[PDB]
Amino acid sequence: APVKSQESINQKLALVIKSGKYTLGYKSTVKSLRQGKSKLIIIAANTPVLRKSELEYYAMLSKTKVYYFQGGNNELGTAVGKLFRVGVVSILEAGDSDILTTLA
Amino acid sequence: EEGKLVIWINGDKGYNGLAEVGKKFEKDTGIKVTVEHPDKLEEKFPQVAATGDGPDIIFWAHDRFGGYAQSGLLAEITPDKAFQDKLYPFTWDAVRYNGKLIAYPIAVEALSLIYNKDLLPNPPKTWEEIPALDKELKAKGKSALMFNLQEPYFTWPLIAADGGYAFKYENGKYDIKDVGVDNAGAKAGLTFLVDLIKNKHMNADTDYSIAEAAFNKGETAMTINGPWAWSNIDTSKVNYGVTVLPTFKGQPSKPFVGVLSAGINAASPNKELAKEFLENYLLTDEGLEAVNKDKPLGAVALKSYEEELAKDPRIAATMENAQKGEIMPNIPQMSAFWYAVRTAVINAASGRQTVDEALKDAQTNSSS
Numbered sequence A: 001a002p003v004k005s006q007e008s009i010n011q012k013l014a015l016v017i018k019s020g021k022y023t024l025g026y027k028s029t030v031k032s033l034r035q036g037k038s039k040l041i042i043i044a045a046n047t048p049v050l051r052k053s054e055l056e057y058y059a060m061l062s063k064t065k066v067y068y069f070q071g072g073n074n075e076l077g078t079a080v081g082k083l084f085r086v087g088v089v090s091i092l093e094a095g096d097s098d099i100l101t102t103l104a
Numbered sequence B: 001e002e003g004k005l006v007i008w009i010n011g012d013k014g015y016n017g018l019a020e021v022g023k024k025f026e027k028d029t030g031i032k033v034t035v036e037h038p039d040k041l042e043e044k045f046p047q048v049a050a051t052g053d054g055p056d057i058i059f060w061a062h063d064r065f066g067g068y069a070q071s072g073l074l075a076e077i078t079p080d081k082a083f084q085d086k087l088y089p090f091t092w093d094a095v096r097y098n099g100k101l102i103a104y105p106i107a108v109e110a111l112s113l114i115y116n117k118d119l120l121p122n123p124p125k126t127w128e129e130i131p132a133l134d135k136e137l138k139a140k141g142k143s144a145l146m147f148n149l150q151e152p153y154f155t156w157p158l159i160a161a162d163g164g165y166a167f168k169y170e171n172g173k174y175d176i177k178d179v180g181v182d183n184a185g186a187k188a189g190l191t192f193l194v195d196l197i198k199n200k201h202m203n204a205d206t207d208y209s210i211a212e213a214a215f216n217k218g219e220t221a222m223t224i225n226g227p228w229a230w231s232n233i234d235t236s237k238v239n240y241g242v243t244v245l246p247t248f249k250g251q252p253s254k255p256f257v258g259v260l261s262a263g264i265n266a267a268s269p270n271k272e273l274a275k276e277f278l279e280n281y282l283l284t285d286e287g288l289e290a291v292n293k294d295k296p297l298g299a300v301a302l303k304s305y306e307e308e309l310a311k312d313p314r315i316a317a318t319m320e321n322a323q324k325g326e327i328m329p330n331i332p333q334m335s336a337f338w339y340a341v342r343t344a345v346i347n348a349a350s351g352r353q354t355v356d357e358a359l360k361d362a363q364t365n366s367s368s
């Protein structure tokens, strides 16, 4: 359930970026999906041009959970700002983050 | 998409009237507004909103929003005091969840007894006298009563009359463990309903359509419905009256009071435009009138306009029945409650189970 603060998502994302493995954007994400390496993908529903359906199609075929961030470009933290900018983030390794057990 | 508002409202409300308010909004701001009335929109919204899809604004009775709020699907609304004062505090409380306003209140609704004055110059004051009244009308090719038996909303007033209730409201809080659909009161009510069907006074298959068509065609003397139905009766030129629900066991039928509300999709990219639309276009005397002229809203939340309409005897009857019933809780468990009670009534009516058996399971399923 999308029951988490933008401040919280940004903090969980910053932790993955800091200590885990992940990809950014359409291209690297579907590749991580097709390869079965993604543990989760986060989609910024309101990002300008986003291949939302296709990403969702790939998450389905790869049986990968997807979490939707609902905020707008306004008042965004560093991590969530990148997210919103690239539309998709694929988590390959959580690292020290609990993003996988709290969002998936 | 940014630059347009998509609205979801139930098919029994004045969606054409709402589309008028949206048409005006478009002329004034250049932002296109689209009104849709999908089926089971209250079940769909949670599904599509959770995935970055769904309308910018969702309309439904307040009982469903706590669930939406808990799943973080609603954008918190924050009208400044000047606007909050324009509406009644009772309606704001209905859309308050965890101490946060989660939607805009629009109107207060309650079911009333609707009768054909030519067929019933004097409607029954008690449920008990309905069987005899039906035997008489059947002798003339008519029936006494017909209303939707598929939705627990409509049968609940009778079930609550002698004792039924959803969750015990203990000093500012609801106890999701103390459910009252199993007590003796609720059993009496439901039994009385089952017997009506057993004795052929009503048919268990009767839905909203069957009932509304029969009443508007002068086939049955009474029906039970909300303000939204008045509009179709008017066109049908049936001489009707709107009054207090009949008592049961010397006690008032207790309808569940609902407040039609408008929530803003948390994922909506137009939250500001949505608030602008709801605060300065819909919740104005002109906005509500547009909608009300299509399908009556009942007792609107906007103080100014409710006062302009307070003299309508149909609204008076509405508020009278509302005053006798209980406001529905808006906590997440309400959905479970409704689903549970629905199954119980449908099963007892069709005989699939006995009153006791049916209410026993609903009792368990509610707090489940």
Ligand SMILES: OC[C@H]1O[C@H](O[C@H]2[C@H](O)[C@@H](O)[C@@H](O[C@H]3[C@H](O)[C@@H](O)[C@@H](O[C@H]4[C@H](O)[C@@H](O)[C@@H](O)O[C@@H]4CO)O[C@@H]3CO)O[C@@H]2CO)[C@H](O)[C@@H](O)[C@@H]1O
Pocket (backbone or CB within 6 Å): B012, B039, B040, B042, B043, B061, B062, B063, B064, B109, B151, B152, B153, B154, B226, B258, B335, B338, B339, B342
């Ligand atoms: O019934 C019409 C009147 O309903 C209103 O009272 C409503 C409550 O406000 C609702 O929250 C609700 O509980 C519903 C629930 O919301 C929903 O899941 C629903 O699902 C149904 C669906 O309506 C229908 O498509 C059908 O096929 O079955 C589904 C599952 O059985 O059902 C719950 C209970 O049935 O319901 C009550 C009515 O019971 C409203 O305030 C009025 O204005 C409206 O006219």
